[PDB]
Design a protein around this nucleic acid. Structure first.
Ligand SMILES: Nc1nc2c(ncn2[C@H]2C[C@H](O)[C@@H](COP(=O)(O)OP(=O)(O)OP(=O)(O)O)O2)c(=O)[nH]1
Ligand SMILES: [Mg+2]
Length: 868
DNA sequence: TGTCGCTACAATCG
DNA sequence: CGATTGTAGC
């Protein structure tokens, strides 16, 4: 009678169906010898409200204090007589519950007795500010049914569920294979210690041609790859895809090439030529229904792909739109709007993975468009078809098949990127750690994950969680650096998980820090038991430590090593975001005093460590909120390591959980400013043999907002400065290289690609005020004017500052590279680069170096020394 | 409909 | 000078 299934996504419609949540997942059907998508409707999720009684009765209007003691009997009588009649609530179940509370609502005791009241989700919702003669507050009035279910049944991310006495639906309500109705949340349980089942992953790439008549994007191809047994706890399979399907349509006026049919048949692929976009969309929807993918992946799926798909479905009136998801509906959610919430609801029951968001979360790249990710992750080159060539492709079989195969290659690259970053396993792991829904986790962001983590933690410890909400304080301390060049050994000491460690050691928690509704609250007494937040953050830190230790295993596959590094960084960021969300104004758990206390203790710790190291008769030259740089004044590495161990032990002696470890040994250092230095990190090889690896932090060479020519010049200069060559030879080599680069720029022998400057966007190009014209925004608008996919917020734009004869400011002469390659009146501003891209960077680098100055750099580049 | 924290340098505009 | 926008660093 039981019903065991693995739930992946949950969908709730607060308005359409009240108190009903649909869970989509996998169920093993023995006859089919495979898992099949199943949908479970958990109905009758009653809404719970906790009432906090007063100590004495109070007149509602007079604001008096009668003095009659208030017991739960009076609270129940009041709710039965006044509130129930006033708000039209017919049936409700009331019980007395002892619950704890430590959050930001004044006059709420730490522990007290509450009157938990439950009634049907169809009944009206009580106001958030409800008060009465017998109670001073009502909680959980606006709690979502999904949240109530998840916290009541202690479901934490995807996992196996056991359903008791399931019933069958009168008529189908989902596009899945198996359906079941649960009449009460009590019938759903969690079963642990079982492997996740393989899921279906469908990677789709589409090619569209815009109609300038109506500025609407029409789809002309959809190449999709599917794998039916993609694991969620193992390595990605090779090849990542099992089968595929391609659909190719024609425009409104154009016609197919002469022998398109014969060439397509000879191609031997699952190509379906759809006469009209209506048929193409119908075929795609039928294919999605047949495959029933659980994880649909793509690039810009949330911003471009799904929005275009739904818009064209609406325009062409393709009947069964809801097949894009897993529920049966009739009215499509309104498109547009911020985020992909409309798209997510349209694809309800299917986990949408946007490798753009995932890549932004996991790795750092100069640009996040598909070509850059392909070049960086897969080390492959992607061929991009201009939209004009897509329009002109419908004139010969060869070009049309090339376009379709390019769409296929884009889909394959998307799947390869998803597998390489290990996005799905990481999403599953983080969702299990946090306890929220997987789709939200893959949507990006750290606030919701931490919010659900703390919801689960506090709920399990008999706490009333706060209702969902309907440079403020000082931060880390950066020591003043001793700018210069150090050719001896610099020893870097860095704390491990400094803020998590502070929270653990000093017992900083909602239940221990006595706040008051900008003064730093006092530290909690050492007698108190560990709070909820220290426990959760300790678990996170321990998981990260386990991953790091697993990384140290010798003879590890480099790809597996990089995956472990990404996982460790993700766990570090999860703990740090747990810290940060204390200082988030819109967060559910805003506890600014706690964040201020954490940062204040961090500053105190750094100051104390600096004082200790200085008291050891050692030189301290830098430090950023958890670290110290020490000038050992030694040339032997063994002594450096011995001193590092000694000082680390001495510092650690003063703490219970905080630990200081040797971050790295720099053979040479070039400390320029705060958060700006270059070093030759030393990684010993064995038997006294060490290998030196360069390391730049914060310099302009490691910023996407500088031309690659400037980056190359600065890298060469830094390499020379950090080398062991005599100083005179270093200066001579710098002069020679600068002269060569000046000659190359003057003679136009530099590649054009080296002139690009990359700047991202924060708002849409339209939303930028008329603050003159920031270069990138300028080019951004041009890109939108032309007939191509638009550039939205958070999109990198590469522009080249070029001469146009305008006698205008450089910032107002920014142009796209294609513009330069096309127009005959635009030329690269050689002087601009030699004077404001190469000279500034090298001049900043060579400030602490004797023999090089701004005038000399200007002279060597062929420029005029006067102005500089 | 969501949206982690703060410190610091840098180029540009008013 | 101060304000903005952007990109690093913890
Ligand atoms: N809120 C927030 N705080 C951060 C972030 N990055 C660093 N911090 C803060 C909190 C960290 O405890 C502190 C020290 O920076 P680190 O980069 O050295 O990280 P941490 O020491 O926590 O760990 P680790 O050195 O990798 O063992 O800086 C972040 O992304 N968000
Ligand atoms: Mg650290």
């Amino acid at each position: 009678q039981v019903f065991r299934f693995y739930w992946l996504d949950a969908y709730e419609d607060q308005y359409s169906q009240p108190g009903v949540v649909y869970l989509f997942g996998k169920v093993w059907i023995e006859s089919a010898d495979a898992y099949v998508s199943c949908c479970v409707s958990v109905k009758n999720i009653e809404r719970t409200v906790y009432l906090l009684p007063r100590e004495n009765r109070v007149q509602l209007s007079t604001g008096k204090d009668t003095g009659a003691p208030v017991s739960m009997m009076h609270v129940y009588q009041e709710f039965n007589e006044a509130v129930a009649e006033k708000y039209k609530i017919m049936k409700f179940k009331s019980k007395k519950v002892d619950k704890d509370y430590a959050f930001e609502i004044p006059d709420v005791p730490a522990s007290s007795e509450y009157l938990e009241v439950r009634y049907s989700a169809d009944s009206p919702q009580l106001p958030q500010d409800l008060k009465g003669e017998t109670f001073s507050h009502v909680f959980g009035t606006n709690t979502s049914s999904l949240e109530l279910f998840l916290l009541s049944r202690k479901i934490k991310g995807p996992s196996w569920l056991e359903i008791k006495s399931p019933q069958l639906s009168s008529q189908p309500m989902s596009w899945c294979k198996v359906e079941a109705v649960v009449t009460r949340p009590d019938q759903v349980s969690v079963v642990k210690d079982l492997a996740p089942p393989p899921v279906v992953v469908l990677s789709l790439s589409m090619k569209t041609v815009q109609n300038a008549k109506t500025h609407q994007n029409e789809i002309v191809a959809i190449a999709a790859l599917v794998h039916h047994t993609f694991p969620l706890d193992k390595a990605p399979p090779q090849p990542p895809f099992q089968t595929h399907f391609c659909v190719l349509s024609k425009l409104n006026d154009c016609i197919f090439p002469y022998d398109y049919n014969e060439a397509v048949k000879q191609k031997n692929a699952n190509i379906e030529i759809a006469l009209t976009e209506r048929t193409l969309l119908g075929f795609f929807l039928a294919k999605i229904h047949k495959i029933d993918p659980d994880v649909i992946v793509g690039h810009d799926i949330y911003g471009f792909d799904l929005e275009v798909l739904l818009q064209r479905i609406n325009s062409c009136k393709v009947p069964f739109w809801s097949k894009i998801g897993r529920l049966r509906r009739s009215v499509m959610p309104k498109l547009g709007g911020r985020s992909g919430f409309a798209e997510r609801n349209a694809a309800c029951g299917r986990i949408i993975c946007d490798i753009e968001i995932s890549a932004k979360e996991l790795i750092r790249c100069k640009s996040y468009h598909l070509s850059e990710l392909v070049h960086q992750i897969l080390k492959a080159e992607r061929v991009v078809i201009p939209p004009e060539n897509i329009r002109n492709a419908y004139n010969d079989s060869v070009h049309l098949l090339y376009m379709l195969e390019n769409t296929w290659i884009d889909a394959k690259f998307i799947l390869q990127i998803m597998c390489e970053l290990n996005v799905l396993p990481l999403a599953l792991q983080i969702t299990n750690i946090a306890g929220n829904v997987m789709s939200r986790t893959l949507m990006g962001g750290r606030s919701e994950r931490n919010e659900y983590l703390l919801l689960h933690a506090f709920t399990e410890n008999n706490f009333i969680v706060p209702d969902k909400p309907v440079a403020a304080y000082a931060g880390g301390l950066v020591l003043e650096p001793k700018v210069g060049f150090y050719d001896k050994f610099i020893l870097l000491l860095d704390f491990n998980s400094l803020y998590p460690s502070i929270i653990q050691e000093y017992n900083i928690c909602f239940t221990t820090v006595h706040r008051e509704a900008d003064e730093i609250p006092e530290l909690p007494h050492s007698d108190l038991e560990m709070g909820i937040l220290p426990r959760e953050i300790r678990k996170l830190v321990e998981r990260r430590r386990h991953v790091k230790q697993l990384m140290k295993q010798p003879d590890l596959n480099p790809d597996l090593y990089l995956q472990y590094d990404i996982r460790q960084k993700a766990l570090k960021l999860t703990a740090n975001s747990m810290y940060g969300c204390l200082g988030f104004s819109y967060s559910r758990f805003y506890a600014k005093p706690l964040a201020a206390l954490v940062t204040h203790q961090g500053r105190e710790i750094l100051l104390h460590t600096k004082e200790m190291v200085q008291k050891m008769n050692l030189e301290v030259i830098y430090g950023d909120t958890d670290s110290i740089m020490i000038n050992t004044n030694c040339n032997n590495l063994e002594e450096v390591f011995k001193l590092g161990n000694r000082v680390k032990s001495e510092i650690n002696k003063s703490y219970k959980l905080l630990e200081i470890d040797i971050d790295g040994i720099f053979k040479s250092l070039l400390l320029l400013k705060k958060k700006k230095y270059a070093a030759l990190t030393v990684e010993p090889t064995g038997d006294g043999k060490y290998v030196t690896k360069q390391e730049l932090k914060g310099l302009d060479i490691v910023r996407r907002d500088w031309c690659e020519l400037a980056k190359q010049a600065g890298n060469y200069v830094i390499s020379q400065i950090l080398s062991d060559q005599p100083r005179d030879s270093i200066v001579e080599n710098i002069q020679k290289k600068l002269t060569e680069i000046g000659e190359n720029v003057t003679n136009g022998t530099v590649p054009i690609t080296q002139y690009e400057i990359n700047k991202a966007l924060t708002k849409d190009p339209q939303d930028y005020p008329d603050k003159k014209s920031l270069p990138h925004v300028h080019v951004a608008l041009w890109i939108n004017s032309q007939g191509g996919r638009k550039v939205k917020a958070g999109d990198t734009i590469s522009y080249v500052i070029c001469q146009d004869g305008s006698n205008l400011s450089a910032s107002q002469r920014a142009y796209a590279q294609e513009q330069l390659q096309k127009q005959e009146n635009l030329s690269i501003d050689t002087q601009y680069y030699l004077s404001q891209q190469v000279h500034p960077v090298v001049a900043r680098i060579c400030e602490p170096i004797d023999g090089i100055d701004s005038a000399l750099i200007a002279m060597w580049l062929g420029l005029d020394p006067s102005q500089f």
